[PDB]
Amino acid sequence: DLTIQKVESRILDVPLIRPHGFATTTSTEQHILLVSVHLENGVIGYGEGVVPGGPWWGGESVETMKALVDGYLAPVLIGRAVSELAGIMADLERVVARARYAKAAVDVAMHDAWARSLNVPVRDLLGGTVRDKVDVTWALGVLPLDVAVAEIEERIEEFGNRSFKLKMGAGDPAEDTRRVAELAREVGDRVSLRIDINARWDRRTALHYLPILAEAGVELFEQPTPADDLETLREITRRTNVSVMADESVWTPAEALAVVKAQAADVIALKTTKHGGLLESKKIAAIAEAGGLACHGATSLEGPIGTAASLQFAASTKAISYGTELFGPQLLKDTYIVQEFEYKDGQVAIPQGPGLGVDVDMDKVNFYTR
């Protein structure tokens, strides 16, 4: 009855309102692998296979995830009750190692299908509610000084964001630094400024310039250097006294443990997609919390479905103690979720209702399908 009859995966290409530039690429649209789990009782659960723009972030892409979901992961679920969630996730490991991003979609789809079948929010399968609204940090892709300052002013006045994250890593380090430092002198008094270089600066470059950003008021350095170099993340804090947030360095529980042991970061960017599901995400939080490391409700620039899965997680996870950056839906020029999220006064309310708390619009899903 609660059996899984079928699992489908659709690649969706949705355009962004503005070009979102990273250290080495620029997105004009997000690619989302919308995965669905179809249960015998007719209910359909949805999950997202999504990374920030492309495989430049970590090696997985919508194409890569569909090949894995379709050809290896999905076939494991078929013929089993969705109420075997934990056991199925464990069996996925036997057919596909790593590939957490692909797995996260299967996990979320199963949670949705199950929570709707039981007629409850997805968070009630994750411990209940701790909060009904979270803070949201607004991230700006790489933008010229004037454009950035302008976008911050607009955001402050229209959405109330009290914190902003500035992506870096494109072009010359000395100029990139100047760009951010200057922007900090014009905004650092009204809001909390953080940066993120997506591991595209080498250790020497980070240790040389980050001090300049620290003096300018930047309060948080997200993954400025390579994911594997935990000693360097620790060293940049030693020399600048400003917190570091690990992102590409932490995908798995084992990697969260490694950061704890290396005292490599004050904060961990927790993303339900990158960790390979809501179950894995709970593990990241447990480890971080035990080592005294704060967790941020981070985003892989998920669409409405993915963002809703992450908000349900934040709603039930006390260890998400450093707000979030779950603004994905806002970056999209259009959606496919029927309902709308409520972003006001620097926050966003948790989606009330069964499943993720938001339903898909099959017309728009079909419209944006590749």
Add this chain to the structure above:
Amino acid sequence: DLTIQKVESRILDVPLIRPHGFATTTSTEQHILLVSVHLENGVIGYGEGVVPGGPWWGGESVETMKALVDGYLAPVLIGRAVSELAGIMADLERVVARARYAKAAVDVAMHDAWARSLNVPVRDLLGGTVRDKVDVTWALGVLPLDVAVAEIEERIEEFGNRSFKLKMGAGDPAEDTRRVAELAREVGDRVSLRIDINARWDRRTALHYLPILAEAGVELFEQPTPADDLETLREITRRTNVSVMADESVWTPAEALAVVKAQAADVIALKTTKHGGLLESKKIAAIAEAGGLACHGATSLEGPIGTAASLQFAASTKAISYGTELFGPQLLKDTYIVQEFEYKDGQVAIPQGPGLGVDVDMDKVNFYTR
């Protein structure tokens, strides 16, 4: 509707079939604090606040737990929806630090009441099911060589336990070692033997006598020394090459992390009661698993309700990778649960049905109620 209207706690004194001897005390009965969460919709949930025999183990007793449950934890629940489980557990921390055994009762009770209202097993609020039966190690309290050998032989034939745990710590260490050493030469071949001294041997004594039990075939040394001394746990494994299981050393996630950093134990005695609830237990499991440490579904000698809770935890947690010792109920002269656990072939099946999958027989509850 899901509103917690009332929370009650009763001390239950249930007789044991045989006296259970520990390192410094001998129990003729087990004390259990039965906590019930009463919801608006009329559904009631139960959880056990229980320690092995008494306060000698860790400072908490049925009396201490009742004082805290009735006078501090309970008031926090009243007027709130049980669907706020996680947030309620966080707020308990504001009025009572530590006291994990007392808190575990509140956590299990809410999960029971909550799962019943949604008409699902408790495991369904913890990820679903990975297994439906678990191995069971049978523990023998302190007993003369003959009485011990006899029991093991008997259990093997009647219930088929394939592993046995021998309690130590009473009287002379040398004699104690000889006692176990000899029992090993008579049974060690057929089954897996483990010991537990409940932290009642000092470092020097453990390092001196444990090699003898190692040479005699004992495969696991459970907490033979003080909870605080992790380096000693590490050192006994270094000199004997036999795995250690941390029990009194690990109650909280931070303590589990400390054991990981100290490489102090190969296995962690995971008890839903000692950890302060099902939520906390999940955390223990996540940290252990990330560090490669195995988890044993251990027991605080809970009654049928507690054991059911721990069985639901084991059904949903792949991290429980070293069997369990959830034989608690079998030690009681009688029970207050209507149904009965299915023991056979050295295992026990996970109870099916809503809540803990086991209903309390109020008539028997009232009969053993102090």
